[PDB]
Amino acid sequence: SGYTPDEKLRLQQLRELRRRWLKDQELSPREPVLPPRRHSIFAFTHVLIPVWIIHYYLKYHVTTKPYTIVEKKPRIFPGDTILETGEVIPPMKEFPDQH
Amino acid sequence: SKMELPDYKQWKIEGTPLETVQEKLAARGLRDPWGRNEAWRYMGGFANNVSFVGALLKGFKWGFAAFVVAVGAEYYLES
């Protein structure tokens, strides 16, 4: 039991009407009629200007107020030299070598 | 746009395990009606796929040769 002639004719008619609409969806090559309206910019207009702005805002508006930016004290080893004081750390104890 | 299909004579039942399935069916008394449709999967570039150990050892020969060359260079450059 296949298609009866009525539904077959209806499906055929709707088929070429749908195909006509589908080809009618295509545009002419003239369309669209749109109305009539330096190598390293990306590394400068996005990077250097915010670097200057943030550096100024941190140097003269953020670090001026107390305790806004807190830095961990650097690691000091036996035998190191301190620029601020000049007192060199004495070396550690004589090593009881195992190997 | 329009793609031209190749000839249908080249898709033969032989060269596959499909003929083994077909002869086992004939031993039980049936026949395979779709040998040629599935015969493209086992014929051409897809024939004789590698095993898993072949997959794991991909590029081992040139890697071993470069390893030998590099270890010889670093063994002779220490002196």
Binding site: - | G44, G59, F60, W62, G63
Partner: protein, 65 residues
């Protein structure tokens, strides 16, 4: 151009992807072989684990009783 479609056959492959895959597989195998020849410790064994029950009695401080 691009890779044209094909019907029931192997697709056309250029030289670039093949040499890229081969070079990367060779790089992986060379790296693992070189790191296995250099270190060879984290995978095969680092330090000798001593046997617990074989320690001598005189250095572990148990009187003979």
């Amino acid at each position: 151009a691009h890779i044209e479609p094909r019907y029931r056959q192997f697709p056309q492959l250029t030289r670039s992807q093949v040499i890229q895959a081969e070079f990367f597989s060779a790089t992986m195998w060379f790296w693992i072989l070189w790191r296995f020849w250099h270190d060879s410790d984290a995978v095969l064994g680092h330090f000798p684990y001593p046997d617990p029950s074989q320690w001598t009695d005189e250095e572990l401080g148990i009187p003979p009783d």
